């Protein structure tokens, strides 16, 4: 078939700090009818905005980190499992995870532990307390933010050999795929008996009942590993059902899967030496490092910004990636690199953030 | 096809997540 999706640029603004914006996320936890909110991170700032009619972007609150040398690279939304209150986790160059109350912009709690910069944060899709961080220290870490424990460290003997740049949970939250500067993509199952038990123990941990500190799992071995997809750093990975989307600097997002064509993802052996490349979503002028692609909630659209301010969009319901391409979103004033984009939960709005601190709003026609 | 089987898996799994979101009442920001 062909793509039908059309957008219109309705507004733009520039943050006064003039520093690159690396991350943008709409809050997908807000209930139907409630206002559409998104956060941006860059420099030592976290900024919240609300989307209103006629393309209005309303500034809500600004968070300025006490450390002027901090560079936030990522953010992720969650909610407090008890009070239903929204929460925002942010991290970057210092390698500290800060949990912010978005209503007040106060740092509620922080987590130190990574040896270096945190490149990405992801919350578990079923459990709001399970936070994953990926780092320049070559490891991923799984945190339980209800008990303030480090559940597991994914790294070591057969872990990444260079910075981990990205990771994603699958839809049901049974596994994680990570990727990084060592050109590899690695699978880490979290539905194993070992990991399910480690998660259960992180919840049983009561500090005002024991003097011993919590013991984290050290997961040295992934459930699948490949260096056969890309020929350089892998800076973005996402699950597409049982398939994987990943990118390097080759001006393509590759769709692939572990094993041979018919192999079940849940029957893949840790020693599996084969991969199957299923297709490529081709684009141009996105050969610089650290550019993320995004999908909408329903995984019907794929978006990626390039180094010159173009925003590519594909329809994932069209089998051939070449016939899946939608009209590239361009504005003559949008000329800086688009680091990340985010769709609103209903896919009605697409926000793009840039290296020149600009924010771009595209409404779905 | 591998395509239709994969889209169906996305459809059923996103539905499970959407039903969990629907039962939640997260306070606005
Ligand atoms: C001054 C400056 C320019 C840039 C590009 N950085 C930058 C950003 C990140 N991020 C943010 C965006 C991103 C996107 C994909 C994967 C990982 C990441 C992590 C990491 C390292 C650097 N660094 O080179 O220090 N710093």
Author numbering:
A (entry chain A): 76 to 440
B (entry chain D): 40 to 68
What does the publication say?
Polycomb repressive complex 2 (PRC2) is an essential component of the epigenetic machinery, regulating gene repression primarily through methylation of histone H3K27, which leads to changes in chromatin structure and thus exerts influence on key biological processes such as embryonic development. The minimal core PRC2 complex is composed of three protein components: the catalytic subunit EZH2 (Enhancer of zeste homolog 2), the WD40 domain comprising EED (embryonic ectoderm development), and the VEFS domain comprising SUZ12 (suppressor of zeste 12). EED contains seven WD40 repeats and adopts a canonic β-propeller architecture with the ‘top’ portion for H3K27me3 binding and its ‘bottom’ portion anchored to the N-terminal helix of EZH2. The recognition of H3K27me3 by EED and the resulting increase of the methylase activity are believed to be crucial for the cellular function of PRC2 in propagating the repressive marks at the chromatin loci.
To elucidate the binding modes of EED396, EED666, EED709, EED162 and EED210, we determined the crystal structure of EED in complex with each respective compound at high resolution. The crystal structures were solved using a EED-EZH2 peptide (40–68) complex, except for EED396, which was determined using apo-EED. As illustrated by the biochemical results, all five compounds do indeed bind directly in the H3K27me3 pocket. The phenyl moiety of EED666, the furan moiety of EED162, and the methoxyphenyl moieties of EED709 and EED210 all make cation-π stacking interactions with the guanidinium group of the Arg367 side chain, with the characteristic face-to-face orientation. While the central rings of EED666, EED162 and EED396 form π-π stacking interactions with the side-chains of Phe97, Tyr365 and Tyr148, those of EED709 and EED210 are involved in cation- π and Van der Waals contacts. The nitro group of the nitrophenyl moiety and the pyrazole nitrogen of EED666 both interact with Asn146, Tyr148 and Asn194 through a water-mediated hydrogen bonding network. In addition, the tetrahydroisoquinoline moiety of EED666 induces the rearrangement of Tyr365 to make the nitrophenyl moiety interact with Tyr365 and Tyr148 through a cation/ π - π interaction. However, they exhibit significant induced conformational changes for residues Trp364 and Tyr365 (with a movement of the respective side-chain of more than 5Å), moderate changes for residues Arg367, Glu238, and Met256, and minor changes to residues Phe97 and Tyr148. Together, these changes result in the formation of a much deeper pocket as compared to the original aromatic cage found when H3K27me3 peptide is bound.
